[PDB]
Design a binder for these strands. Structure first.
Length: 674
RNA sequence: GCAAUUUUUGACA
């Protein structure tokens, strides 16, 4: 099949931090980057599914990207410009994703910028003190214009007149300045009394094309849209938004229908206004396709097959694409508002992928959905903290355990409209891991108990049918059974052998302990890692030889991954615990902490590892062979999960707020960077 | 959708 990305959420409260060029390509500022989305036939997506894909990222700003604008000049649609709280304006080439050139002319926080629609190399930027810079990127010239001591919110160069720029301020002031006359103010458009969010020029020049020079429209926090006459410097029309509610009021003035005007509205609803008169709501016949929070940016995009689309960004973290002909939602791209901490596929709902995210919502992605490549449901009730751990029930459909950074353990019925059940017992620290296993005493004295491991070092056994009851610290059983007097290690990982007969605990000191049912008799201690154990995974039971099921891979804060073979020690069932000090296999190549390892269900002994070194490595573990290295994340990987359907496909999540679905066969590098 | 949120996580172990 083919790669796919859930990207970070578009940035909020910026008058222009997204834009699109024909064909086409959509770009949106998110965090300190711009993410690029191919839209239309060029996307190369599965037939019958929405034609778009996230394809690249502009990396280099060191603080929030506040502004983004493409060059709309034929022959240079690949050029674009950004502004950032790092104080720079960068010019980029999207083909190579590199900085062409840049400036640091602004002495105050940049508000926005706009590529001249008329002058091929002109980018105009404005800051929160009211200073405007003109920048001609080819001659490397610039001009400083300090118009008014006033906080710029938005700026839009005229599409008709190369010298005229409209500027909108936090206090509701709107001016038109002439950049050839040292930024002289040509018009003061008085009327708004609160933030200007958007300025759109009429796409036709002249003032003989409207039922009541050039016309322009301004949208404001004051809940009105004003249309102005650029000859008489006065208002000619006021539109009042229909029903302190949130509002970002942005505009798009369609070229093919200049008597119409598109705006955002309360709640992120989109409206098409008839200027010859009043408004039509987008997606009126299924209102639920609308955004559910304020919309910030609207960007038209005409595909190479001449479909006229409109992309919208929103506080609700969805990017939506609208068919302007029908006012219907063509597709929705979901996005992530924090680290992708955890990934888990359900064994009983094929392709159902749960994602634990730092923004306090669980995503469930129906990855195999035929209608939609990003069929994602969001669960927030009872979550409300970073989701650091997940584990689907092994047999119960829709039953999902989750754990949070604040120590909470919960149980979701994802097929339902119900809030989750919360365990009355919390960990003191982050929930690292959840696993289902057979109950142990006193609980065993439900087919499966829920086990949770917290950062404080305790593993708890929860009864999924009595979560408001007490959870049990398994150390009490471990001590009893094994006659342990000493100070218990701090547990940092738990992993059940597939047969439910053997539990492995990883510890902060690097040790791995092997315990047997029914009473957790200690049969083995593995002393191989020298640092905290993050991840343990037992090989599946459906490989070509029974021996494979005794294989256990593990990763610590050191870079070297080990495989151990527990067949001898388990089958011997010793009456006093053995120590293993030698690995069955060693997998060297990463250069930082290993956060997660997972065996392919499709192969004998094929492992993928996620690392702080910013890569996922695929190994033929039994031959200690590095196969391929995925380098698509820009940050520390936190989780990895094999596709349950495709031997070639792996999903990974990182602290770059991204989930990538990628193919082992498409990777150029065989090993991690050295 | 029917919540909240001007959000966007120093590093070790």
């Amino acid at each position: 099949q083919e790669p796919r990305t859930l990207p970070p959420s578009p940035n909020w409260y910026c008058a222009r931090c997204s834009d699109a060029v024909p064909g086409g390509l959509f770009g949106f500022a998110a965090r300190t980057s711009v993410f690029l989305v191919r839209v239309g036939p060029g996307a190369g997506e599965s037939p019958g599914t929405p034609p778009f894909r996230v394809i690249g990222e502009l990396v280099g700003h060191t603080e929030r990207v506040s502004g983004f604008t493409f060059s709309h000049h034929p022959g240079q649609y690949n050029l674009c410009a950004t502004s950032s709280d790092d104080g720079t304006v960068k010019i980029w080439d999207v083909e190579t994703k590199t900085v062409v050139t840049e400036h640091a002319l602004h002495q105050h926080t940049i508000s926005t910028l706009h590529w001249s629609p008329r002058v091929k190399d002109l980018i105009v930027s404005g800051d929160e003190k009211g200073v405007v810079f003109c920048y001609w990127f080819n001659r490397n010239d610039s001009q400083h214009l300090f118009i008014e001591p006033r906080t710029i919110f938005c700026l839009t160069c005229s599409p008709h007149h190369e010298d005229l720029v409209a500027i909108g301020y936090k206090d509701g002031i709107v001016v038109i300045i002439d950049i050839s006359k040292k930024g002289e103010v040509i018009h003061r458009l008085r009327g708004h009394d609160d933030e200007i969010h958007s300025i759109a020029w009429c796409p036709l020049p002249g003032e003989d094309c409207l039922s009541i020079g050039c016309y322009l429209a301004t949208g404001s926090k004051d809940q009105t849209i004003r249309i102005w006459s650029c000859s008489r410097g006065r208002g000619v029309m006021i539109l009042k938004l229909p029903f302190k509610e949130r509002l970002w009021l942005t505009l798009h003035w369609p070229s093919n229908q200049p008597t119409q005007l598109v705006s955002s509205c309360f709640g992120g609803e989109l409206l098409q206004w008839d200027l010859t008169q009043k408004y039509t709501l987008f997606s009126a016949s299924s209102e639920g396709q609308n955004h559910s929070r304020i919309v910030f940016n609207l960007c038209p995009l005409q595909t190479e097959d001449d479909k006229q689309l409109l992309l919208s960004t929103s506080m609700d973290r969805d990017v939506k694409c609208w068919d302007i002909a029908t006012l219907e939602c063509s597709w929705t791209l979901p996005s992530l508002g924090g680290f992708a901490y955890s990934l888990a596929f359900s064994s009983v709902d094929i392709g159902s992928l749960a994602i634990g995210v730092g923004d306090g919502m669980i995503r469930v992605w129906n990855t195999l959905s035929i209608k939609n490549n990003y069929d994602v449901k969001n669960f927030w009730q009872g979550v409300k903290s970073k989701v650091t751990a997940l584990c689907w029930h092994p047999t119960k459909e829709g039953c999902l355990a989750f754990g949070t950074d604040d120590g909470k353990v919960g149980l979701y019925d994802t097929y339902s409209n119900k809030p989750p059940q919360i365990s009355s017992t919390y960990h003191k620290k982050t929930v690292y891991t959840l696993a289902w296993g057979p109950p142990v005493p006193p609980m065993s004295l439900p087919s499966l108990a829920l086990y949770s491991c917290g950062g404080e070092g305790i593993v708890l056994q929860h009864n999924p049918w009595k979560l408001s009851g007490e959870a049990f610290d398994i150390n009490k059983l471990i001590r009893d059974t094994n006659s342990i007097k000493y100070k218990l290690p701090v547990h940092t990982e738990i992993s059940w052998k597939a047969d439910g007969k053997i539990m492995a605990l990883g510890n902060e000191d690097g040790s791995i302990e092997i315990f047997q049912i029914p009473n957790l008799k200690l049969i083995c201690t593995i002393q191989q890692h020298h640092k905290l154990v993050n991840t343990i995974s037992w090989h599946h039971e459906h490989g070509s030889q029974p021996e494979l099921s005794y294989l256990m891979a593990s990763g610590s804060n050191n870079a070297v991954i080990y495989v151990h073979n527990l067949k001898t020690v388990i089958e011997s069932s010793p009456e006093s615990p053995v120590t293993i000090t030698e690995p069955y296999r060693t997998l060297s190549g990463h250069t930082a902490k290993i956060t997660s390892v997972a065996w392919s269900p499709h192969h004998d002994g094929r492992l993928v590892s996620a690392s702080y070194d910013g890569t996922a490595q695929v190994w033929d573990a039994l031959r200690e062979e590095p196969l391929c290295n995925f380098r698509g994340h820009r940050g520390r990987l936190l989780c990895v999960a094999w596709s349950p359907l495709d031997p070639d496909c792996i999903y990974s999540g990182a602290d770059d707020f991204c989930v990538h679905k990628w193919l082992t066969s498409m990777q150029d590098h065989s090993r991690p960077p050295q």
